[PDB]
Design a binder for this molecule. Structure first.
Ligand code: CA
Ligand code: CA
Lengths: 178, 178
């Protein structure tokens, strides 16, 4: 498509984010959560390509296609990689997509910050069983699998490839496209 | 004692906070959560006096003694007033203190921002059954009641009289001391 959205969220500590036309770079050393990455203002069904490096020296680190949905309000993740990630919520099932199987989870965030202000909403997460830092993510396979398990999505809002972390340091240089 | 701590937390929208030597003032119109108020760097057992106004035109609004504790990490509230507050967690019991009864709740915040960075910790809340905007809060009565129900506190960290809100507008002018 063409990246037209820059996800830049951070609460504290050392987070050096460098967005670009074809991707982004991040170096961090923080105790606080941050979500940075690049993508699109309105997500679609187009298979998303990502690639590069993603190192987590310590703490929690996640590399994933991240996004939102409205009516209902939904925060979703399709984790291609994760370290020291406190698996929260309820497992719903699985979906085999793009070279590996993903365990699907549903979680709820009460009075949490969102694109609609602080609200309560659900999370639809797909965690890859075989972590990678390079590949393609056929997003429709996840949306279909989510819908079939009762994980209902609304209108598509932004959709980015993001790195999220806290409790340590690490770095990532990723190329994003679709 | 003498106010030596200024609680100033906010995530977005219109929040006009004005701290002072004997209290604070706030006018807001936001969808995002904010916690502002004044107090002390290290909380004690000293009965806290508060007084003034606290109007909530719309959305969620809470007037309460707010604080933290370390080892274990604990966020506590002693709500003297609240509007449209999504009572979250588990009721534990009650405590009669300073002219009214309070319903005690215990809740857990997973991967939430804290004084120790983003962490998972419990909340000990005392919600006054008869809301007020002026009075004294004998904090020990709450700490004793909390301990007796298994709500264990650690080392005292900051302790302020704060106003917290989201989803609307309102204003508050409070005098703080102990
Ligand atoms: Ca990895
Ligand atoms: Ca009131």
């Amino acid at each position: 498509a063409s990246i037209n959205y820059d996800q830049n969220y951070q609460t504290g500590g050392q987070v050096s984010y460098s967005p670009s036309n074809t991707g982004f770079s991040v170096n961090w050393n923080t105790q606080d959560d941050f979500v940075v990455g690049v993508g699109w203002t309105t997500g679609s069904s187009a298979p998303i390509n990502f690639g590069g490096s993603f190192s987590v020296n310590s703490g929690t680190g996640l590399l994933s296609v991240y996004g939102w949905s409205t009516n209902p309000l939904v925060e979703y993740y399709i984790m291609e990689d994760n370290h020291n990630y406190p698996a929260q919520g309820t497992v719903k099932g699985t979906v085999t997509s793009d070279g590996a199987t993903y365990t699907i989870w549903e979680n709820t965030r009460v009075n949490e910050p969102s694109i609609q202000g602080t609200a309560t909403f659900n999370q639809y997460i797909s965690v890859r069983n075989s972590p990678r830092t390079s590949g393609t993510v056929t997003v429709q396979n996840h949306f279909n699998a989510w819908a079939s398990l009762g994980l209902h999505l609304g209108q598509m809002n932004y959709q980015v490839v993001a790195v999220e972390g806290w409790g340590g340091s690490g770095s990532a240089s990723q190329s994003v496209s679709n």
